[PDB]
Structures are given as C-alpha cells and as structure tokens.
Scaffold this active site. Structure first.
Site, mmCIF file in Angstrom:
data_model
loop_
_atom_site.group_PDB
_atom_site.id
_atom_site.type_symbol
_atom_site.label_atom_id
_atom_site.label_comp_id
_atom_site.label_asym_id
_atom_site.label_seq_id
_atom_site.Cartn_x
_atom_site.Cartn_y
_atom_site.Cartn_z
ATOM 1 N N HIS A 843 0.834 -1.201 0.000
ATOM 2 C CA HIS A 843 0.000 0.000 0.000
ATOM 3 C C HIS A 843 0.867 1.248 0.000
ATOM 4 O O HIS A 843 1.459 1.590 1.042
ATOM 5 C CB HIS A 843 -0.943 0.000 1.201
ATOM 6 C CG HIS A 843 -2.044 -1.007 1.094
ATOM 7 N ND1 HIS A 843 -2.655 -1.566 2.196
ATOM 8 C CD2 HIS A 843 -2.645 -1.556 0.013
ATOM 9 C CE1 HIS A 843 -3.584 -2.416 1.796
ATOM 10 N NE2 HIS A 843 -3.598 -2.430 0.476
ATOM 11 N N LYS A 850 -11.383 -2.346 4.367
ATOM 12 C CA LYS A 850 -11.814 -3.691 4.007
ATOM 13 C C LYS A 850 -13.108 -4.049 4.738
ATOM 14 O O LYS A 850 -14.035 -4.593 4.135
ATOM 15 C CB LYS A 850 -10.717 -4.708 4.323
ATOM 16 C CG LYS A 850 -10.986 -6.094 3.768
ATOM 17 C CD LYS A 850 -9.751 -6.969 3.856
ATOM 18 C CE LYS A 850 -10.012 -8.345 3.271
ATOM 19 N NZ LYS A 850 -8.785 -9.186 3.292
ATOM 20 N N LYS A 867 3.253 -5.123 3.908
ATOM 21 C CA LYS A 867 2.474 -6.292 4.291
ATOM 22 C C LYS A 867 3.393 -7.361 4.865
ATOM 23 O O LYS A 867 4.438 -7.669 4.282
ATOM 24 C CB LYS A 867 1.703 -6.830 3.085
ATOM 25 C CG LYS A 867 1.206 -8.257 3.217
ATOM 26 C CD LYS A 867 0.247 -8.594 2.086
ATOM 27 C CE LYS A 867 0.051 -10.092 1.940
ATOM 28 N NZ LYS A 867 1.258 -10.741 1.358
ATOM 29 N N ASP A 915 -25.648 -20.700 23.236
ATOM 30 C CA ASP A 915 -25.948 -21.765 22.290
ATOM 31 C C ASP A 915 -25.557 -21.345 20.882
ATOM 32 O O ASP A 915 -25.704 -20.180 20.505
ATOM 33 C CB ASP A 915 -27.431 -22.153 22.311
ATOM 34 C CG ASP A 915 -27.688 -23.508 21.672
ATOM 35 O OD1 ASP A 915 -28.853 -23.961 21.673
ATOM 36 O OD2 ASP A 915 -26.721 -24.132 21.190
ATOM 37 N N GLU A 1004 -23.554 -26.413 26.068
ATOM 38 C CA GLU A 1004 -24.026 -27.710 25.606
ATOM 39 C C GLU A 1004 -22.909 -28.734 25.770
ATOM 40 O O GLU A 1004 -21.813 -28.558 25.225
ATOM 41 C CB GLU A 1004 -24.474 -27.603 24.150
ATOM 42 C CG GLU A 1004 -24.304 -28.856 23.316
ATOM 43 C CD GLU A 1004 -24.431 -28.570 21.834
ATOM 44 O OE1 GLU A 1004 -24.601 -29.527 21.049
ATOM 45 O OE2 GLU A 1004 -24.361 -27.382 21.453
ATOM 46 N N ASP A 1237 -33.713 -19.475 18.129
ATOM 47 C CA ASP A 1237 -32.407 -19.764 18.715
ATOM 48 C C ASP A 1237 -32.317 -19.202 20.128
ATOM 49 O O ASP A 1237 -31.675 -19.792 21.008
ATOM 50 C CB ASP A 1237 -31.291 -19.192 17.839
ATOM 51 C CG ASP A 1237 -31.076 -19.991 16.569
ATOM 52 O OD1 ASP A 1237 -31.427 -21.189 16.548
ATOM 53 O OD2 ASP A 1237 -30.547 -19.419 15.591
#
Ligand SMILES: [Mg+2]
Ligand SMILES: [Mg+2]
Ligand SMILES: [Mg+2]
Ligand SMILES: [Mg+2]
Ligand SMILES: [Mg+2]
Ligand SMILES: [Mg+2]
Ligand SMILES: [Mg+2]
Ligand SMILES: [Mg+2]
Ligand SMILES: [Mg+2]
Ligand SMILES: [Mg+2]
Ligand SMILES: [Mg+2]
Length: 1282
Positions: A843, A850, A867, A915, A1004, A1237
């Site tokens: 860059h 992004k 980078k 959950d 769970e 849910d």
RNA sequence: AAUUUCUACUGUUGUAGAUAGAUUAAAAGGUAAUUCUAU
DNA sequence: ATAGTTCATAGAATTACCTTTTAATCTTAAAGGACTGC
DNA sequence: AGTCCTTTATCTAATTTTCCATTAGAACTATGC
C-alpha cells in the site's frame, strides 16, 4: 457486590511471555563480526543431527536388550488369569492381587535394563565426551559399526556417513549439559514409574493386554469357524514373519517356522517385546504386499473378514485382532512394499516427462501407436466386426463401475445377467430350481471372473424388452462408452502442451519449490493431467486379464485383440507407481525452518538468573526510563558484572536486576546441609541423622540409600524443622532473604515449612549503573544489549497494552515485590527468525487504502505500510517463563470451592447460557433466579461502540472454499486460525458479562447430549471455544481495572481450574457447566410443551386408530379456534395432558384455522356450535381427508417458522397459558426470548437453573449430581411457573 | 495492509481481544492409491 | 407441481502424506570433578 | 582460592468414566394432482 471478589490468588500457574529483542547500538556489528548468528544456525542443525545419532544408538540398545529379556511363563500366566478374572466382576483384593503380578513383571524388566552395562552410560557425559582414560560408548559403538562395514545412516539424507556422525558427536565435546533436557526425555524411555513414555509401560500396560485379547480371540476363533483361517496359505505367505529364533514355551532354540497355536501361546509373548517381533506379529495380523505379486498376501484379520462376509454373520466381527503398539524409539521399514521416494522437484519433472513421452513413443508388434491401437480397436468395437463371445469384461469393481457410469446403477448388469442365465438354464420351475441347477447357475453369474460380451448383450436384450421403453438401458450405450475412450488422448495432449512452461518452472534441481502454497495453481494442473491418465487406466482396466489361477476353463478370446491390448495396458499401468510417488512428494508440508535457538557460546545460557550463577549463565536484566533490556555478556568476558565492577560504575543511567532465589527447598536444604563439603559446618545431631536416614520427617518421602522408610513422626518432623532453621541461620548468605518463619509447633508436616521457605526465598533488587559504562561495554563488544520490545513499548503506543505487557511490567513492580505474585522463572530462551519474504510496499503512501462498517472508508496515512513487515528482515526473539500466584499452592478440588461459593451467594447469581444456532453463530441469554431473562444479545457481531465488526458475514464466505476442493493436493488454509481469532474475540465478551452480572456459564455438553443438527458453528469449533473460555478464566484480569483492586493485574479472577482433556471436562469446569441440549429448541418457554406426537399419515385404518385415542377434539366456540385434547400415556411414552390449539399462522403463510374450517366444510362434519368432532372424524373413510388433516395437524405443531428469507426466524407456541393468549417471539416481552435460537439458549439456561437449584441444596458431605434427565427437565420446565 | 505471535482491522508508525513456551513420545483421525470381498 | 433419493456403499488390509489430541521432562542454585593458581 | 563443566538433592495432596440419551446442488426418479 461481586460474587467472585474472594476468588483471587487461588492457585499458581506458569506462563511464557514472548518479546522481540531489538539490538542496541553496536551490538549487532559485534555479533556479526564474531559470526555468532551463523554459528548458532549451524549448531541447531548439528544438535538435531546429534540427537538423531543418539536416538539410533538408543534404538539398537532397546532392540538388543529386549531380545535378551525373557519373562518367565509363570508370571505371564498369573497375570493372564487375573486380568481375565477382572472382567467378570470388580473387587478390591482382586485389583491389588493383579497389580502385584503386574508390578513384579515390571520390576523384573526394570532390573534387567538397569543391570545392563550399556544403560549406565546413557545419560552421563560418558555418552558424548568421555573423561581421559576411557572412550565414549557412543563413539565406541559408531567406530565398531564402521569397522563392521554396516551403514547406519542410509535412511536419512542429512547424515552422509558414519564419519560425519563421528565429527558431529565430536563437535559437542564440552557441551554435554546442552543435552540435559534431551536426556530427561530419554530417561522417560526407561522409567520404572507408571508413565506412558517407557518401554516397560508399552510392554506390560499396553501390548500385553492386547496380546491376551488376541489370544482369547484366536482360541474363540478355533471353536467357531475353524476353517476360516487358511493355515496353509499363511504358512505359505507370511513365512518370514512366522520365522522366530527361539520358542519360549518349550524354551527351545530353533529357527523353525511357527504355527498360530505356537505363536499365540502365552510363553511366546517374549518374541513380541522387541520391535522386530512387534512388526512380525502385526504383519501376520495384517499381511504384506510383495514386490512382484499383484495380489496382497492376506493376514489373519482379512481371513476373519472374508469368512464373516461369506457367512453373513456379523457375530464374528468381534474376533478382529488388535495390532500391537510400536516400541518407544523404533524407526523401522515395513515388511510390506515401500515405494521409492523423490528428493526434489526435478525428480518429479524427470519421471513424469519420461512416462508421458513413453506412452506416445510406444509401438506394438504392429506399426500402430498406443492411441492408434486403442482407437482402432474401440472404433472396431463401434462396428459389430468383433465376436462378443471372445471379448470379456471383468466381473469386478470395473464392471459395476461401468454399469453405474452407463445406466446410473451398479446392479443392472448383475441382475440382468443373473436373470438371463436363470431364464436360459434350468427354465423349468424357475423360482426354486434343483440343487445341481443352482450350483451350475451359481458359476455363470457369480464366481465367474469374466463375462463374455455376448452373454452381456443377450442378458441386456432380454432385460430391456421385459421392462418398458422409458428406461433405455441399451448395450449400444456401453459400446459407445468404450468408443469414447480414444478421445481422452487429445485432452491429455492439450494439457501436456500447456504444461511446458510449468515444467520449465521446476525443471531445475532447486529443492522443494512445489511444496509451498505459491505452487497451488501449478499443482492443480499437474494433478488433473495424471487423474485423466489414471482414469483412463481404470476405464479400460476392465478388459485386462488379471493373470490369476485359471486352472481350468480358459477363456476363448481374440488373441490379437488382447495381445495389443495387454501391451498398451502394461505400458499404461506404470502410472500407478508414478501417481503414488509424486503424490507422496507434493503433499508434504512446505517448510520446517522458522527459527533456531541462540546460545552465544554458552551452553547454559539463561538457565538461571541468580547473581551467583550470572558468570555461568551470562544473562542479565536492566531497566531504564520505563524500558526493559536484556544483556548477554561475552563468554570470555565472564566477570563484567562482578561485585567489584558494580560500585566503580555506579551512576544514574541503567538499573541492573539482582535476582536471588532458593528453588526446590525439599531438594536444596538436604543437599547443602548434609553435603560432604559442608556437613561439618552445619554439624547434624546424631538424632537428626537417624531422622533423615529413615524418613521419619516425611509421610511418603524417600529414605537414605540402603535405609528403609519408617512411619512419620510429628516430633521427629518438628525437630528436623528446627534443625533446618538453625542451619539456615548458619548459612553464609541465605539470611539475606530475611526469613520470617511460623512457630515450629504450628507446622503439621514438613511441606508447610518447605512452602514458607520457597515463598520467601525469592527477591529482586536494583543496583544503579552509569549509562556511560554500559555504553562503553556495548561499544567494546564485551556485552550484547537488546531492548525487550513489542507494540505497547513504543513511544507511539497510547492504547490498552497487551496482557503480556502488563504481566511483564508487573514482574518488577514494587507493589508486586512486597508480597510477590509474579516471579521470574529460570530457563529462558533466545531465538532468531531469518527473513522469510522480500520487502514489498503493498500500500503506497498517501493513497486512499476492508471492513464495510468503518466510517472512514478511505483512511489516508502519511506513511506507506508493508504487508507482513515482521517477516521481511531477520529478528531476535526472547521467550521468558514466569510463574503467577507464586505463593499459592495449586488447583485442588476447585469445583468444590466454586460450588461452596455459589451455594452461599446463590440469590445474586445469574445464569449466562450460550448456544450455537442455525441462523446465529452463537446467542447468549442470561437469566435471573426466577426464570426471567435480564439481557440478551448476539455474538454474530463483535464490535466496540466506535466501530463494530460483523463476523457473521465474515464467516459466511469461508465454508464454501473447503467443500469445493477438499481432496485437492495443495491448498493453503488460514481457516482454523481465523475461526480461533473470532472465538478469541468472543471469550473477552463472555468474561465481561460473567464478571459484571455475577453469572455462571452454561454450555451444551459436547461429550454427551450434543445436537445432531447442522449449524453455522461446527461442533469441533464450539469445543475450541469452550476450551478457550476455560483457559481464559484460568487467569482473568481486566485492563481497565486498577492495579490492586480485584480484576486488576495483582488480583486476577480465577474461576476455572486448568484444562486437562476434553473428556475430563465432564459437566463442570469451575463456573462453567455442561448440560445435554436435548429438547432445548422445539419447546414452549411458558408451559414447557414440546411436540412429541410426530404424526405421519399412514393407511386409512391406521389413521382411524390414531385419532381414536384422542381425548377431545371439540371446537372452541368462544375464541374461534380448534382445541385438541389427549394424554401421552395412551399413545405409542411421555406423561401429561395438553390442549393443542390452532391459533396464528405458521410457515411452510399457511393459516391452520382457515385450512381446517375449509376441510371440515367440504366434508360432512359440521362444527357449528361446539360439536365434538372426535367421534365424527373416526367414521370417515376417504384417504385424502386424513391426509390433509394430519398435514394441518403437523403444521399446527410447527413452533419454529422456517422463512427462507434470512432476515428473521422466530417462534410461536401452540398451547395457551392460563391467561389464554399464546406466546409469540414476534411480540414478546424482554423477560421472554425474542426468537427461536433464543428459545434454545433460554432452555439451556433453564437446565442451568435446575443445576443451580441442585447446588443450592447440596450438603457439604456428599457428591453433587449434575446429570439432568429428560424426565426431571420436563417436570421442571412444565411446572416451573405454577 | 505495521503485531512477541495469531485473528479481525485501520482502530493512524499502530487500535481491540486473545496468547505456556522449549523438548520428547505416542495414539487416534482425515484423504489418496492398491489387493480383496459383501451387498 | 412438489417431494424423495442419489451421486453405488461398506468391511478387512498395506503404503504414503497431512492433522489433532494427550502425555511426559524442565522452567535451578549449588555441590562435585577436575584443574589451576596463589 | 578460582574457573569451567557437569551432576544432585528429592515434600505434599487428592484422582483414577459412570451411563446421562427422538460436501452440495443437481438429477433422475416417484408420487400426487
Ligand atoms: Mg526376547
Ligand atoms: Mg546417508
Ligand atoms: Mg535448555
Ligand atoms: Mg522418532
Ligand atoms: Mg465375484
Ligand atoms: Mg560453552
Ligand atoms: Mg556455562
Ligand atoms: Mg500420597
Ligand atoms: Mg494495544
Ligand atoms: Mg510464514
Ligand atoms: Mg493479518
């Protein structure tokens, strides 16, 4: 008032911090002038090579001594009888009487390995660098092996010959202690103790039970299916593996071939201690491939399998033999065929090019090319010129493959030929012919290796005309399939032409460029080409005559046809080894070359920070202006920071760390106070010598050499403690610690005094040193100085520092040093990471550059950013161990104390249940004690209020990439790392919620009771999240909290014990509980009604019988809907009575009330004024009526609304409350869930609430019951709100 | 697209959260290929 | 017009490559072997 | 005495599994209207 305020400084745990080491001043120039970096890079590789050589020596020693070991048959038989008795029933005396024999066997083996002369030099310096007058056993063995002309390092390429091994071993003379850690591992190989690393453990604890299981299975196999094992054929095949040197039952020395009865005799178990015997046993279990033979020689298990499959009795599956586990350090080639490897890319290129030019160059007896021969023959098969009584398909996987390819079914050809031969042969009374008729028919359809194409054509002609014209299923389709085969060579040619440039890329001898991710695309093309050829080989594999056992009944085949065919096929079948070889090469992990250990000419570098060891360890720490520095003094300049050098250069520049530590009091105090050099100074009373020799001061401590343990005496212990205090006062320098001990009488065991010693025996101080002196020694090169650095240590750093930054800075804080929590640990290490990638400004500066939700979409930076900058240049790295809660004993019975706390603070506790959902990645609901929700939000989006990050959309794209190319050869994967990063974002939010709301966490249970469905977050990933939460709650500090209040750097929340295994998570890991997720989603939150009817439409009679047993179906006049009534006990078997109602609109909108009204209007039944329809509907007879009725009944029970539009997915209830209105998550209050849910999470929370109630009533004496049954859960959730 | 290191990022020469390393061993699973079989 | 079913599937082996999980040692200063020096 | 390089000393506690349980998209069929 936080519930967890007192759960601080509960147990100690170890952590390793990591930093970059920025060279300071001229230290890098000095290092590079001395060539230390390159010397350490070379020494790392030579260290691995030396460890490999020592491992080879260990392998040979293990082989020899285990082939010498003989276990007496009586011990083996006693062990066997007791081990098999233990399966019937448990008893304490039986378990102890078993462990007696087990330990006797182990002690015999251990005494044998201890008596061996070679063992005694394994861990000394006698192995590597011997004292004068004697030569090292490693060099002795290497020179003897060389003089005996044996090549030891044929296997690996890294060690050229024995001479290079000699000089490598020679290189480490004077560096023996560099191997100390390594030697520890190798000591674990021969341990008398019960650890899984030892060969004794592997013999007795692992392979002996397996061999006894296999012996029992063989004895059982001899009574049922005695001819299942083909004794003759295994005596033929596995002769090398059946050859043994001595038979131990008869104690005879003979190299005869053994029998299975002889092999499986208990006394012969000795022949399977050595690794070679293990390979022999495993090979007679599993067979071997031979180099020339096309068919694999079979093992015992394959015979068991074949007989069980021919009998169709899956009872014998249970007699399958278990292979024996390997020996601990063994590295052995296989008795099955091993294919030659490839060393680099050039090998792949050369071999592939050779083969692919071969296939085009080959010519047969005729002048026709391979492609020409195949095209000519297959276009000749297009026409009917050849006689199909002479061309044969192989009745094997290729025949069913071609059937599935042509007709989209594997059985059509088989059933067709079976029916043709059944119709032609024994036509009279077709269905059940005679005994001889079936046996003749048996041969023609099965037990026939090949089928003539004429037989196939007649079978198909019959079968087709019998069935209707809809399915074509013609023989011309098979003929055209084969006709299409010659066209593959042209696609091969296109790919082969385009492969020229890719071949140029790797044509050179340059090593391992294909293994890198950068080759991905080029790796695909290559593979595809091979696939084509390989597919071609499988396509025409059917004609190939397998050349096996046509004793009689030869096929009458076209000889010229099969001559040219077999020539082409023999030339093409060379791709199988080529495909295998280059697949084995290309699928390797690209590199193993990240970093290596820096030593700075000191084998004992940074092994200990104490000032008395500073010359030997050469590692010093400094501080200056809130910046931390590490210093390594030149090995030759050993005394740079002596006492005399401190005062001369005292100033204001830097602050030196003065480290003092008494480690391992239980070892150190008897070591110093009874040492031959100083036993006279601390003159021990004769009584104290008695009290030490017999370990009367220790409950389970070891006594002196040759003495015996006596019973613990409390007065002897307190007298020994008084002697320890006197000796400490005598010590020349340990009184610098300023020990404040408790009264001797208050000690009830010596470990309490040891704990006080170890807690108070560690201090840090600071001696000032002028900046000029350190600058001078850095410029002079005698000292190498590094700044300990990371992000938070830059001057530009203004944000919340990393947690490890806080831990490190706390190491030397004074608030820490008054009552030490953070303690610097001994063996730190230094590493060097070379440049991995070249620099590249991805860059450029001052461009827009992004995440979608960031407002500043075009953020401009004055600077151009690289980078992966950290990999562009070489770097130094520092790994430093530390211990936290240094004065705390450790985690013991943590769940018990957590449960005690929760029992006493129950009224304030909340329940945060989490959950994973079908729509949401993960949803959380925290519930108060009564059952009402207090807060609910989603983890789909993790975000600060400044800018928020959506991880739902970020995780939506990932799953498509794997399923598309899961079987490809090269494929780079950042997926695991990215998922773990998201979960690491989530754990912090979970911790914040826990601490602020004083909640327990409910999950769970993923070992048992997990959901069978398909969700956005995979099960394994969810398990990773659970483990990460455990690890995080080990040591929980909030960066915003003050340094001294709870939750701060000094006072960390410890709400979970250390993770051990996934299976041992069980149902409680601290404040985290695990419940079965059964019936958590499809359930009503106000009344606890789950659809358990599952009504499917069947025959009219059965639907009459179904609706017979309802209680009432009468229509409700008042509120305008229908009402069903029933008792589950009357059905096919839960309990209770419910009122099913047809209010609202579900989704498949299909309104059930209107549908039912129309259905009942169209039929005779009138529901005008409260007519009880139950008796009316049972009288109807039409099928459509019951069909639509059960359909509407099922639609009524759909509490979950499946909108294919993904904006919202909500839940509605079929049963009204006492008020009379139904619950809908569409319009639901805050205290109730707000989607489906959410209902799953809320009922996970209700299971957690059952668990909280069980904790509330737990008496201190007895065990807590954490298993929630569906019966108890149903009762609770149904009568929770009454 | 800067990282002790990792995941997201710009969150401006870095922002959030996470981060026990080094060494050693073994078992289990995945996916190819190959030899058989049974449906 | 939709559902339902299937892309053959599944058991015993061998080789090779990959990954994941668990389980071990250590996270030490000072005595002890040598040799040297005063 | 000093130096370097390797070997040594040896606490304490609790555990040992418990049993709880209703690729994908496409394709060819296969029903029913
Ligand atoms: Mg032996
Ligand atoms: Mg070699
Ligand atoms: Mg080390
Ligand atoms: Mg190895
Ligand atoms: Mg057959
Ligand atoms: Mg050295
Ligand atoms: Mg040293
Ligand atoms: Mg004990
Ligand atoms: Mg930060
Ligand atoms: Mg890299
Ligand atoms: Mg990144």
């Amino acid at each position: 008032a936080s519930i967890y305020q007192e759960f601080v400084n509960k147990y100690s745990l170890s952590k390793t911090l990591r930093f970059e080491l920025i060279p300071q001043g001229k230290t890098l120039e000095n290092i590079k002038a001395r060539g230390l970096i390159l010397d350490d890079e070379k020494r790392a590789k030579d260290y691995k090579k030396a460890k490999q050589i020592i491992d080879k020596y260990h392998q040979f020693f293990i082989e020899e001594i285990l082939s010498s070991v003989c276990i007496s048959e009586d011990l083996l038989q006693n062990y066997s009888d007791v081990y098999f008795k233990l399966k019937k029933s448990d008893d304490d005396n039986l378990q102890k009487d078993f462990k007696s024999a087990k330990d006797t066997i182990k002690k015999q083996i251990s005494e044998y390995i201890k008596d061996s002369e070679k063992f005694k030099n394994l861990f000394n310096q006698n192995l590597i660098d011997a004292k004068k007058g004697q030569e090292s056993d490693l060099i002795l063995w290497l020179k003897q092996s060389k003089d005996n002309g044996i090549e030891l390092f044929k296997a690996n390429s890294d060690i050229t010959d024995i001479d290079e091994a000699l000089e490598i071993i020679k290189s480490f003379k004077g560096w023996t202690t560099y191997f100390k850690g390594f030697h520890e591992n190798r000591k674990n190989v021969y341990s008398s103790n019960d650890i899984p690393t030892s060969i004794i453990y592997r013999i007795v604890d692992d392979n002996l039970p397996k061999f006894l299981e296999n012996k029992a299975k063989y004895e059982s196999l001899k009574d049922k299916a005695p001819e299942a094992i083909n004794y003759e054929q295994i005596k033929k095949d596995l002769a090398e593996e059946l050859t043994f040197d001595i038979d131990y039952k008869t104690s005879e020395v003979n190299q005869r071939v053994f029998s299975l009865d002889e092999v499986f005799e208990i006394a012969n178990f000795n022949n399977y201690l050595n690794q070679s015997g293990i390979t022999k046993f495993n090979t007679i279990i599993g067979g071997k491939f031979v180099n020339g033979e096309n068919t694999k020689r079979k093992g015992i298990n394959e015979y068991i399998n074949l007989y069980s499959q021919q009998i169709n009795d899956k009872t014998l599956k249970k007699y399958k033999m278990s292979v024996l586990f390997k020996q601990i350090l063994s590295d052995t080639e296989s008795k099955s065929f091993v294919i030659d490897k490839l060393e680099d890319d050039s090998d792949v290129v050369t071999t592939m090019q050779s083969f692919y030019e071969q296939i085009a160059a080959f010519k047969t007896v005729e002048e026709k090319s391979i492609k020409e021969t195949l095209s000519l023959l297959f276009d000749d098969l297009k026409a009917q010129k050849l006689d199909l009584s002479k061309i044969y398909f192989k009745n094997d996987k290729s025949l069913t493959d071609l059937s599935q390819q042509v007709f989209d079914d594997y059985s059509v050809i088989g059933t067709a030929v079976l029916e043709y031969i059944t119709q032609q042969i024994a036509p009279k009374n077709l269905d059940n012919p005679s005994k001889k008729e079936q046996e003749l028919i048996a041969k023609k359809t099965e037990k026939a290796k090949y089928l003539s194409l004429e037989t196939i054509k007649l079978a198909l002609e019959e079968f087709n005309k019998h069935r209707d014209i809809d399915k074509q299923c013609r023989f011309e389709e098979i003929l055209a399939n084969f006709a299409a085969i010659p066209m593959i060579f042209d696609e091969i040619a296109q790919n082969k032409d385009n492969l020229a440039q890719i071949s140029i890329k790797y044509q050179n001898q340059g090593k391992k460029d294909l293994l890198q991710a950068s080759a991905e695309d080029d790796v695909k093309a290559i593979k595809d080409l091979l696939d084509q050829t390989n597919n071609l080989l499988h396509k025409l594999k059917i004609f190939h005559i397998s050349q096996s056992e046509d004793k009689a009944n030869i096929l009458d085949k076209d000889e010229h046809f099969y001559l040219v065919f077999e020539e082409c096929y023999f030339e093409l079948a060379n791709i199988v080894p080529l495909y295998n070889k280059i697949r084995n090469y290309i699928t390797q992990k690209p590199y193993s070359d990240e970093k290596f250990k820096l030593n700075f000419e000191n084998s004992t570098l940074a092994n200990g920070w104490d000032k008395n060891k500073e010359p030997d360890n050469t590692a010093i720490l400094f501080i200056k202006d809130d910046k931390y520095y590490l210093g390594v003094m030149n090995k030759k300049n050993n005394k740079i920071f002596d006492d005399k050098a401190i005062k001369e250069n005292k100033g204001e520049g830097y602050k030196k760390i003065v480290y003092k530590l008494l480690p391992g009091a239980n070892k150190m105090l008897p070591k110093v106070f009874f040492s031959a050099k100083s036993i006279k100074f601390y003159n021990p009373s004769e009584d104290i010598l008695r009290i030490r020799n017999h370990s009367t001061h220790t409950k389970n401590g070891s006594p002196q050499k040759g003495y015996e343990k006596f019973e613990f005496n409390i007065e002897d212990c307190r007298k020994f403690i008084d002697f320890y205090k006197q000796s400490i006062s005598k010590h020349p320098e340990w009184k610098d610690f300023g020990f404040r001990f408790s009264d001797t009488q208050r000690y009830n065991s010596i470990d309490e005094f040891y704990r006080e010693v170890e807690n108070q025996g560690y201090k840090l101080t600071f001696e000032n040193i002028s900046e000029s002196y350190i600058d001078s020694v850095v410029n002079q090169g005698k000292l190498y100085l590094f700044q300990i650095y990371n992000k938070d240590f830059s001057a530009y750093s203004k944000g919340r520092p990393n947690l490890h930054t806080l831990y490190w800075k706390a190491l030397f804080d004074e608030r820490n040093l008054q009552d030490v929590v953070y303690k610097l640990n001994g063996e730190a290490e230094l590493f060097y990471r070379k440049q991995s990638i070249p620099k590249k400004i991805t860059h450029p500066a001052k461009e827009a550059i992004k995440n979608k939700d960031n407002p500043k979409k075009e953020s401009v930076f004055e600077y151009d950013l690289i980078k992966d900058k950290r990999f562009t240049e070489d770097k130094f790295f520092f790994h430093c161990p530390i211990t936290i809660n240094f004065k705390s004993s450790g985690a013991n019975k943590f769940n018990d104390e957590i449960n005690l706390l929760l029992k006493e603070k129950a009224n304030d506790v909340h329940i945060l249940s989490i959950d994973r959902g079908e729509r949401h990645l993960a949803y959380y609901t925290l519930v108060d004690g009564k059952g009402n929700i207090i807060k609910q939000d989603t983890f789909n989006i993790i975000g600060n209020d400044r800018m928020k990050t959506n991880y739902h959309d970020k995780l939506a794209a990932i799953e498509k990439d794997r399923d598309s190319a899961r079987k490809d050869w090269k494929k780079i994967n950042n997926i695991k790392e990215m998922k773990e990063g998201y979960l690491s974002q989530v754990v912090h939010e979970i911790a914040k919620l826990v601490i602020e709301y004083n909640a327990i966490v409910v999950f769970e249970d993923l070992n048992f009771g997990f959901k069978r469905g398909r969700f956005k977050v995979e099960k394994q990933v969810y398990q990773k999240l659970e483990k990460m939460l455990i690890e995080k709650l080990n040591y929980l500090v909030f960066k915003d909290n003050e340094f001294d209040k709870t939750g701060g750097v000094l006072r960390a929340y410890q709400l979970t014990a250390p993770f051990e295994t996934f299976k041992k998570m069980g149902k409680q890991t601290g404040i985290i509980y695990y419940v079965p997720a059964g019936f958590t989603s499809k359930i009503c939150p106000v009344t606890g009604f789950v659809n358990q009817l599952y009504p499917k439409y069947e025959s009219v009679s059965k639907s009459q019988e179904f609706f017979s047993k309802f209680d009432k179906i009468c229509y409700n006049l008042d509120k305008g809907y229908f009402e069903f009534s029933f008792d589950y006990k009357n059905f096919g078997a839960a309990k209770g009575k419910w009122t099913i109602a047809s209010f609202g609109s579900r989704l498949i909108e299909v309104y059930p009330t209107k549908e039912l009204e129309k259905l009942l209007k169209d039929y005779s039944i009138e529901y005008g004024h409260g007519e009880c329809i139950k008796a009316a509907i049972c009288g109807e007879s039409d099928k459509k009526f019951f069909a639509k009725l059960t359909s509407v009944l099922n639609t009524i029970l759909q509490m979950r609304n499946s909108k294919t539009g993904t904006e919202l997915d909500y839940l509605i209830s079929p049963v009204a409350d006492v008020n009379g209105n139904f619950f809908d998550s569409r319009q639901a209050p805050k205290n109730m869930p707000q989607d489906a849910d959410a209902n799953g999470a809320y009922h996970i929370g209700l299971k957690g609430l059952m668990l909280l109630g069980r904790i509330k009533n737990n008496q201190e004496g007895k065990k807590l019951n954490l298993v929630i049954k569906n019966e108890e859960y149903f009762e609770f959730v149904q009568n929770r709100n009454n």
